[PDB]
Amino acid sequence: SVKSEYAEAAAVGQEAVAVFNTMKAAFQNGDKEAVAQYLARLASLYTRHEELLNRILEKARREGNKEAVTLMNEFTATFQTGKSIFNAMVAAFKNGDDDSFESYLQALEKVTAKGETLADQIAKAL
Ligand SMILES: Cc1c(C(=O)O)cnn1-c1ccccc1
């Protein structure tokens, strides 16, 4: 069901949360080789989540489920905001710009928390 599919996407999202916080600790401690590997892991996790979310949105549209479509349109738009900030963080790491990295890390935390306040409504609508 789209709902088992939603729970699958939610767990993948949670895996990125977990890896992100381990990565933030590694960044603070100065362990750049660890950060590099976590950033690759996260890229894969975020690419996977994006794919699952598009499949859920496409299934909502074929169902003609208007409230689910509306909420997933908003949620996916916010996801692209996170994606752009994440890509900028990765570039700041590549450039050795720790100031920008710290900034982007903070901004991403605020974007993802705001984004996840839509989850309750998505789950009831799907
Ligand atoms: C997971 C997520 C959300 C959310 O879960 O609401 C909002 N943006 N992002 C995101 C974070 C990093 C990369 C791409 C997207």
Side-chain angles (χ1 to χ4, degrees), residues 46 49 75 78-79 82-83 86 108 111-112 115-116:
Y46 290 135
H49 199 196
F75 187 95
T78 300
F79 190 94
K83 183 171 179 190
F86 173 76
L108 190 53
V111 162
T112 62
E116 285 287 335

Side-chain angles (χ1 to χ4, degrees), residues 16 20 23 33 42 51 53 60 74 77 86 88-89 94 100 107 115:
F20 181 100
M23 181 272 295
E33 299 185 13
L42 285 162
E51 223 272 305
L53 292 164
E74 299 175 320
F86 173 76
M89 195 178 60
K94 177 223 188 204
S100 297

Side-chain angles (χ1 to χ4, degrees), residues 14 33-34 64 79 84-85 105 113:
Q14 284 311 108
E33 299 185 13
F79 190 94
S84 292
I85 298 160
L105 193 153

Side-chain angles (χ1 to χ4, degrees), residues 1-15:
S1 89
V2 65
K3 218 160 292 183
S4 71
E5 282 144 21
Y6 191 60
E8 291 156 36
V12 173
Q14 284 311 108
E15 193 180 323

